[PDB]
Amino acid sequence: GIFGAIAGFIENGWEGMIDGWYGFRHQNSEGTGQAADLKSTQAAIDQINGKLNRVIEKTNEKFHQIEKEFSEVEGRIQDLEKYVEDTKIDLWSYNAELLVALENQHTIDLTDSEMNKLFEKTRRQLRENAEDMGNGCFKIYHKCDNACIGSIRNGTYDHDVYRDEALNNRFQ
């Protein structure tokens, strides 16, 4: 993907994350656990639904048209009728092929984006209290219990509370 997160610096996805599309796993003094991030899951899904609504959209309505099957050889005028239909089908076939390929490239890129946005939002929250370990994981340089982890996921983690402790651990 164009951001390098999914199938990039995050080695692989999590089959055990069954209640969201993106999320956090943590390790701390009390153990390990997981949680979905709703707002990024919803972002990816909303975009994808936007794209579905545009495509699953009302088919045109046509009634009487030209004929497209013929029981007798007639020559010039039937040549035309066939060429007309064959030309339309090829054009529409091309459109459908291109559409699906563009959308799919964009779908894979936008979901990559969201993963990357969530990571960056997290990196920003932690300030000087953590280092990026390169695989999508943050080493956090202070005691960080389940509530603390919870505040990181809520967006109410106050880095100044932990700053003297983390800076001390980071630089020795």
């Binding site: 009634f63 009487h64 048209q65 099957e69």
Partner: protein, 54 residues
């Protein structure tokens, strides 16, 4: 065909309001007994052996 060597050829004529139909013949005329109404809309026709369902 069904016993005959003879044929009838079918033709058509559309007469617009205000216009006037005249028919002239000294033989071989297969005459109309009147007219079909013309309408416009979503109507068409299709070739198929698929059965009809409810």
């Amino acid at each position: 065909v069904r016993g005959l060597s003879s044929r009838i050829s079918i033709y058509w004529t559309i007469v617009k309001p205000g216009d006037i139909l005249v028919i002239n013949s000294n033989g071989n005329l297969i005459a109309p007994r009147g007219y079909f109404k013309m309408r416009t809309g979503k109507s068409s026709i299709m070739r198929s052996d698929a059965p009809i369902g409810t």
